Structures are given as C-alpha cells and as structure tokens.
Amino acid sequence: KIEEGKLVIWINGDKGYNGLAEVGKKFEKDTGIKVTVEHPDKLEEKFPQVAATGDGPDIIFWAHDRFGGYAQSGLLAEITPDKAFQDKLYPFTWDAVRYNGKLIAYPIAVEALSLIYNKDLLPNPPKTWEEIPALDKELKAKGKSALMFNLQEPYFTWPLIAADGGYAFKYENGKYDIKDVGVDNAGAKAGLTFLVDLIKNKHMNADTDYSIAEAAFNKGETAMTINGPWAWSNIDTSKVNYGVTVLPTFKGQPSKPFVGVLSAGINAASPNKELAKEFLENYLLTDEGLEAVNKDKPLGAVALKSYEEELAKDPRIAATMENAQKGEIMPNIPQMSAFWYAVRTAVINAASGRQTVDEALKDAQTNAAASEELRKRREAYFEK
Ligand SMILES: OC[C@H]1O[C@H](O[C@H]2[C@H](O)[C@@H](O)[C@@H](O)O[C@@H]2CO)[C@H](O)[C@@H](O)[C@@H]1O
Ligand SMILES: [Zn+2]
Ligand SMILES: [Zn+2]
Ligand SMILES: [Zn+2]
Ligand SMILES: [Zn+2]
C-alpha cells in the first residue's frame, strides 16, 4: 500500500481518525503529500504480520505496550527528535516509548480507564465494587441496570483483577522478570471470581462488547460504564448527564487500570521516514494538530506540555489522571502480547462458563511465559 510519494497511517477505530485525517489534509495542502488514514481491524496483530513481507503503513498508532515487540523484531525505525523537541513533551511519556535505551515511537497522549456514570440515574456513584450488585437489583425497579462495559477485551476487566494483587510481570530493580507472572495468585482469582459471579447472577452478560455497552450507556439504559477518554465524544452527543470518576475499590483497594501511552511508530520498511517525522513533529504534535484529533475523539492527557496545560482544567481529565496514578504504566516488553492473549482467553473462558476461574487463570499463568514460542518467529524471511 505504501509508496515513495505518500503517507499511509494506521490508527484504531475508536480514536479520532477523522481529526487525524484533517491534519493529513493540512499536510497535503502544504507539501503535496497525500495522507491516507486507515483503521484496520485488529491492526496491532496485523502490523507484525504484513511488515515482514515489506508491507504495512508508514506510521502505526497504538498504545506503547505493543511497541517493544515490534522493536524487538526490527519492525520500527529509530526516531530522532532533537533536544528542543523532547523538551516539549513530558519526560515520563518518553520513558514509555523507550526500549533498550532507544526511542522507538512518538508519544501522543496518556490513556486510563475511568468510571463513567449517569448523574440523573445515579447522583452519587458507588465507591465500591461490592455494592454494585445491590445497586443493580435496586435499579431494576426503574427498568435499568447498574453497569455495562466491554467484557471481550481484558483491558477493561484488568483493573478489577489487579485490585487485590493481580500483576503482569514482576518488576524488580529496573527489569521485568518474564518468568514471574501474577495472574495465578489469590488476589487475581478473587477479582475474576467477583466478575464471573456478576455474570452468573445476570447482573452482567458475558456477550457484552464495546458497542453494546456504549449503546446502553448512551441511551440511558445502564447507570454506569467503564471506558477511556475516546468514549466521551459519543456520550456528549447522547445528552446523557454524565460524570467521570474514580473506579470502584475492591476489597478496600483501588482498581488498578493498565495505563497506556498512545504512540506513533515509523515502519522500518517505510520509504517515507523523513516525511513521517515531519508530519508527526511539526503537524500532529502541535497545539493545532492535537486539537483537531482531540475535538474528534478526546485523547486524554496529551504528551505535549503546552496543550496539556490548556486541557488539564477539564474535570474528566483530572479523573483520568487520578485513575492513572492508582494504576500501573504498561510494560512494553515483547512478552506483553503473550500476556494479553493469555488473560484474554482466561476472561472469556471463565465468563462463558467453559472453564472455572481457578483453571482459567492457571492456564493463563503458563501461556504468558510458554506461548512465547508462537510469537518468537525470528523473521520468516531474513535472519536476526
Ligand atoms: O484488551 C487487551 C488490549 O488492551 C490494550 O488495548 C487498548 C488500547 O490501549 C486503548 O487505546 C483502546 O483502544 O482499547 C484497547 C482495548 O480494546 C493494549 O494496548 C493492547 O495491546 C491489548 O491487546
Ligand atoms: Zn477513514
Ligand atoms: Zn444482589
Ligand atoms: Zn485479598
Ligand atoms: Zn520541515
């Protein structure tokens, strides 16, 4: 799809791709270089597949956790911003896009899940997961439910699993121990057991996905949802009176969402590396550029200091950051994709009733360290 005369960009379908296309149009007007923005299905899995052939976009947008795996496989080009450009973005966002001492992507925004609630149905949202089932029963009288969120992606269920002690890989000294996974412990089991019990008792449905949960919240059928900043735009249109707040506690402990830094990497096999840098540094990562994307779908807490200062006054962004503080920045190590696959499988299988919580997470513990063999291709063509 890529050619020396134009830019191809991949970004997830829940992000402000229309706003990004607007920045692309501005870039075209100035340079004659046409920018194509695509939102492929499961693009985070598609990229490492197509890039091996010599295909793939010029620029890929995803949360930072996937980028280490890409970098390890030599699929990304090393980015080279000067001293002056680095100072315009928050230092911790640069750390999220650092792999083996090298910058491997441009950071765009910090993302964290929050509790989103209907203020008319629920003037005071629950501080506690434990109190949600009773609230759900209470709301049935009015023909409503308490809570609906995406049960198909482990990103959304992870904050509850992590609350009482679930973790990805053990972080000691400065490195991650890829053998010490923490999805098998009593805390992680307690969290998933609570969720499965909600499902079994019909407080939630195992089949609920992103679109179902969104439709239900935005039409005022459910009092609460769990989602990121990107979701606020469609809620704004719905005229549901909504608030954004701290996620509920579990066993007196905060929910711990995995924090993502939306990042832009340059394909190593791109003929347009220079134009890619030019677009990202001088068009996207500006007040005007981020505004265009943000006005489409909210980015969260943007990496660009000057624009973040303008946005920080938003109470919804303050809540995002409060949840972010209580969560953990995702690791970016290559094993993260195996982790996500293992947890994804564990949640779906436990939620459907195919496996017990105990058995589901036992198998997930293995796959987060053993299913590395399927991932470790070492290039289908060419060597290490
Ligand atoms: O569900 C596992 C999945 O979680 C994260 O993906 C998030 C992404 O960070 C957000 O920007 C948003 O698009 O929702 C996604 C979940 O559907 C990880 O970044 C991703 O690697 C992982 O597979
Ligand atoms: Zn489009
Ligand atoms: Zn009950
Ligand atoms: Zn406990
Ligand atoms: Zn220039």
From Swiss-Prot:
Record organism: Escherichia coli O157:H7
PROSITE patterns linked to this entry: SBP_BACTERIAL_1 (PS01037)
Gene Ontology annotations of biological process type: maltodextrin transmembrane transport; maltose transport
Domain of life: Bacteria
CDD domains reported for this sequence: PBP2_MBP (cd13656)
Keyword Hydrolase: no
Record's keyword annotation contains Signal: yes
One Pfam family linked to the record: SBP_bac_1
Protein name: Maltose/maltodextrin-binding periplasmic protein
Subunit structure: The complex is composed of two ATP-binding proteins (MalK), two transmembrane proteins (MalG and MalF) and a solute-binding protein (MalE).
Classification via InterPro entries: Maltose/Cyclodextrin-bd, SBP, SBP_1_CS
Family: Belongs to the bacterial solute-binding protein 1 family.
Task of the protein: Part of the ABC transporter complex MalEFGK involved in maltose/maltodextrin import. Binds maltose and higher maltodextrins.
Subcellular location field: Periplasm
Gene Ontology MF annotations: carbohydrate transmembrane transporter activity; maltose binding
Keyword annotations of the record: Periplasm, Signal, Sugar transport, Transport
Record-level GO cellular component terms: ATP-binding cassette (ABC) transporter complex, substrate-binding subunit-containing; outer membrane-bounded periplasmic space
